[PDB]
């Protein structure tokens, strides 16, 4: 019923600004405060401020004076947050929220690195025993995220997806799958690495 629907992920150069949106449906937009909240590392939350959409009046956290501007468009039931003069400290997930319901979040990456597809390397043994662990190493891409699908989804129980880390300004992650040895190499195992930001998919068949 009540829904807050936010705009998509953003990759912005340091020094620029970005304006993200929060569309309200299922209630009277002008009756509820809209709050904005910054989350880093999927953990620490910091409140930015809130606006009354009936009037447009804003109250900010002093920590965001000059960094954030909150506005509304009453005719479209949308709240907006503009962040100015961006730095890498502004990379985070940003949520809009009313008192009882949050949007799904907008991920902001502030960087001058260009969108780059991953290199994908197979991890295969060149066993003994009844199981075998395989993997794919996904290196040198930007920005987040990638998805690694094993045997287009038929494997997922015994899959481990390791979160990406930065190296040389680009992301690297890995993914493992453990499968009965009676199924590999006698049957195909493939990792399919999708990087939607670069409109690239890479499929590797794992070979002994």
């Amino acid at each position: 019923e009540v829904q807050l629907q936010q705009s998509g992920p953003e990759l912005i150069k340091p020094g620029a600004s970005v304006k993200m949106s929060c569309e309200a449906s299922g209630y009277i937009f002008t009756e509820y405060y809209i709050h904005w909240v910054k989350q880093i590392q999927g953990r620490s939350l910091e409140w930015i401020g809130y606006v009354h959409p009936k009037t447009g009046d804003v109250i900010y956290n002093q920590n965001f004076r000059g960094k954030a501007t909150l506005t509304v468009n009453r005719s479209s039931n949308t709240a907006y947050m503009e962040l100015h003069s961006l730095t890498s400290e502004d990379s985070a997930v940003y949520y809009c929220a009313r008192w009882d319901s949050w949007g799904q979040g907008t991920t902001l990456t502030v960087s001058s690195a260009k969108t780059t597809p991953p290199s994908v390397y197979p991890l295969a043994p060149g066993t003994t025993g009844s199981s075998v662990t395989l993997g794919c190493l996904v290196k040198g891409y930007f920005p987040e995220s990638v998805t690694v699908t094993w045997n287009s989804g038929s494997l997922s129980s015994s899959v481990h997806t390791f979160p990406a880390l930065l190296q040389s300004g680009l992301y690297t992650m890995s993914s493992s799958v453990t499968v009965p040895s009676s199924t590999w190499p006698s049957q195909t195992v493939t990792c399919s690495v999708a990087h939607p930001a670069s409109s690239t998919t890479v499929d590797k068949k794992l070979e002994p």
């Binding site: 709050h35 999927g42 953990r43 620490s44 939350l45 910091e46 409140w47 401020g49 809130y50 109250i59 956290n61 002093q62 920590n63 949520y95 929220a97 008192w99 009882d100 319901s101 949050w102 949007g103 799904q104 979040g105 290199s119 390397y121 197979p122 991890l123 295969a124 043994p125 060149g126 662990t133 993997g135 190493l137 290196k139 129980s157 481990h160 997806t161 390791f162 979160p163 990406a164 880390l165 190296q167 690297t172 992650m173 890995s174 493992s176 453990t178």
Partner: protein
């Protein structure tokens, strides 16, 4: 500003047990209007925070009665009576009585299980990669508990510390273990100047490491 401090940082529980977490504020959350705007939120992995309790104890619509909030002034508690799998995630307290609004730093509710040693796998750099002039050696440390673990890389017996990227999974939803990937990055030239590469996993399940190695001359 008002500081909310949460304890513990992580809380492993058996399913069906009672869990209790603390939120303490630096100033009273009692508002001059006589109400106390102390709220609890749950954030599951990959989801937004969701409201559980507001006004210290009032359950938001649809929130099961095993969630009970209590406290007053500067001291608050959330008690979950019979933890279920859908309850796992990070719990935040939040106060709505002051500007700025502030949150606690989160308590991660997780599953306690029996200790388990890692299953360790080592991979030399793929032939494909070496053409790129880079060489990544990978070590998966899979399905262990608890989450704390060490990995030491050695090159011909000599400990190696830079060039290492260590990444942990979140708790597994099937068996409640953790896994971690460790990657040693070298140039192709560095990689080809040495003979053996070793991953040593040290975990509380043994006073000796689990050692996986390969010799590049094989």
């Amino acid at each position: 500003d008002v500081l909310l401090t949460q304890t513990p940082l992580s809380l492993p529980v058996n399913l069906g047990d009672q869990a209790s977490i603390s939120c303490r504020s630096s100033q009273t959350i009692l508002h001059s209007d006589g109400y106390t705007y102390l709220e609890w939120y749950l954030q599951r992995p990959g989801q937004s925070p969701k409201l559980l309790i507001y006004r210290v104890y009032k359950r938001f619509s649809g929130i099961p009665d095993r969630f009970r909030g209590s406290g007053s002034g500067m001291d608050f508690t959330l008690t979950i009576s019979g933890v279920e799998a859908e309850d796992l995630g990070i719990y935040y307290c939040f106060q709505g009585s002051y500007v700025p609004r502030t949150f606690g730093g989160g308590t991660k509710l997780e599953i306690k299980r029996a200790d388990a040693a890692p299953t360790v796998s080592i991979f030399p750099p793929s032939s494909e990669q070496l053409t790129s002039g880079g060489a990544s050696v990978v070590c998966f440390l899979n399905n262990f508990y608890p989450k704390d673990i060490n990995v030491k890389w050695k090159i011909d017996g000599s400990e190696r510390q830079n060039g290492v990227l260590n990444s942990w999974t979140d708790q597994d939803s099937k068996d409640s273990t953790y896994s971690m990937s460790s990657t040693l990055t070298l140039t192709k030239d560095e990689y080809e100047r040495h003979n053996s590469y070793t991953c040593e996993a040290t975990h509380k399940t043994s006073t000796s490491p689990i050692v996986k190695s390969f010799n590049r001359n094989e």
